[PDB]
């Protein structure tokens, strides 16, 4: 179909994605997204919010440690490229990943209030 | 690299109508060409709504409106009176973070196109 996506999320590459205006903890963003039928974003490549990258803002994205994993997974379960984010390494373990268009992603407590990027995929 | 059908490969959707979020800058009449070329017009605002979404995804565009003059009216490019105000020999209107400036036609600035 490709062309579903609400009124008021943005369709790009059959996809559908809704940028938040309200700051919401990064569980409140979970569960916001889920209430939404969607997913918090889980980034494939850079390039899947292109029609975005002028924007200077943050947004918290689907990117939480797996203990057990000994490794940082999206909401799905699905690993985390090494190529995707190279300061990774770096990211503190008990944090929340958020993340600017511009490429940029930050490590931050949990519980601090951002925007928010919910996303369906179509297949 | 599947899309929806009823916008070209690289643009978006949003309210019944497809963006294309330039990248390039370029003078106004350079960037209403370029959109006519793309096969629609350059950047339309209908709400202060879209222009609020507007601002989230691109902080300053070109938008289809403008003078012959710094006083006849403002007119769109459909051939009416633009009802939204817009804030020395600026003739053309751009959209900057959520307000609609005045600036001089020649300079180069980021345009989007936008479908019916």
């Given at each position: 179909d490709?062309?579903?996506?609400?009124?008021?999320?943005?369709?790009?590459?059959?996809?559908?994605?809704?940028?938040?205006?309200?700051?919401?903890?990064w569980?409140?963003?979970?569960?916001?997204?889920?209430?939404?039928?969607?997913?918090?974003?889980?980034?494939?490549?850079?390039?899947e919010?292109?029609?975005?990258?002028?924007?200077?803002?943050?947004?918290?994205?689907?990117?939480?440690?797996?203990?057990?994993h000994?490794?940082?997974?999206?909401?799905?379960?699905?690993?985390?490229?090494?190529?995707?984010?190279?300061?990774?390494?770096?990211?503190?373990?008990?944090?929340?990943?958020?993340?600017?268009?511009?490429?940029?992603?930050?490590?931050?407590?949990?519980?601090?209030?951002?925007?928010?990027?919910?996303?369906?995929?179509?297949? | 690299?599947?899309?929806?059908?009823?916008?070209?490969?690289?643009?978006?959707?949003?309210?019944?109508?497809?963006?294309?979020?330039?990248?390039?800058?370029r003078?106004?009449?350079?960037?209403?060409?370029?959109?006519?070329?793309?096969?629609?017009?350059?950047?339309?605002?209908?709400?202060?709504?879209?222009?609020?979404?507007?601002?989230?995804?691109?902080?300053?565009?070109?938008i289809?409106?403008?003078?012959?003059?710094?006083?006849?009216?403002?007119?769109?490019?459909?051939?009416?009176?633009?009802?939204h105000?817009?804030?020395?020999?600026?003739?053309?209107?751009?959209?900057?973070?959520?307000?609609?400036?005045?600036?001089?036609?020649?300079?180069?600035?980021?345009?989007?196109?936008?479908?019916?």
């Amino acid at each position: 179909d490709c062309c579903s996506c609400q009124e008021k999320w943005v369709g790009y590459r059959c996809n559908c994605y809704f940028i938040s205006s309200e700051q919401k903890t990064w569980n409140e963003s979970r569960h916001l997204c889920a209430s939404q039928k969607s997913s918090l974003l889980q980034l494939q490549n850079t390039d899947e919010l292109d029609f975005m990258s002028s924007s200077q803002q943050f947004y918290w994205i689907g990117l939480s440690y797996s203990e057990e994993h000994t490794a940082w997974l999206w909401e799905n379960g699905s690993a985390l490229s090494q190529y995707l984010f190279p300061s990774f390494e770096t990211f503190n373990t008990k944090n929340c990943i958020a993340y600017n268009p511009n490429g940029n992603a930050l490590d931050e407590s949990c519980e601090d209030k951002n925007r928010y990027i919910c996303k369906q995929q179509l297949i | 690299a599947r899309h929806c059908g009823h916008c070209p490969e690289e643009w978006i959707t949003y309210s019944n109508s497809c963006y294309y979020i330039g990248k390039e800058r370029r003078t106004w009449e350079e960037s209403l060409l370029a959109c006519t070329s793309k096969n629609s017009s350059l950047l339309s605002i209908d709400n202060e709504e879209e222009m609020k979404f507007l601002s989230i995804i691109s902080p300053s565009s070109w938008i289809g409106v403008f003078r012959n003059s710094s006083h006849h009216p403002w007119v769109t490019m459909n051939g009416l009176a633009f009802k939204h105000e817009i804030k020395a020999e600026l003739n053309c209107a751009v959209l900057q973070v959520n307000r609609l400036k005045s600036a001089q036609c020649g300079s180069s600035i980021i345009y989007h196109c936008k479908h019916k």
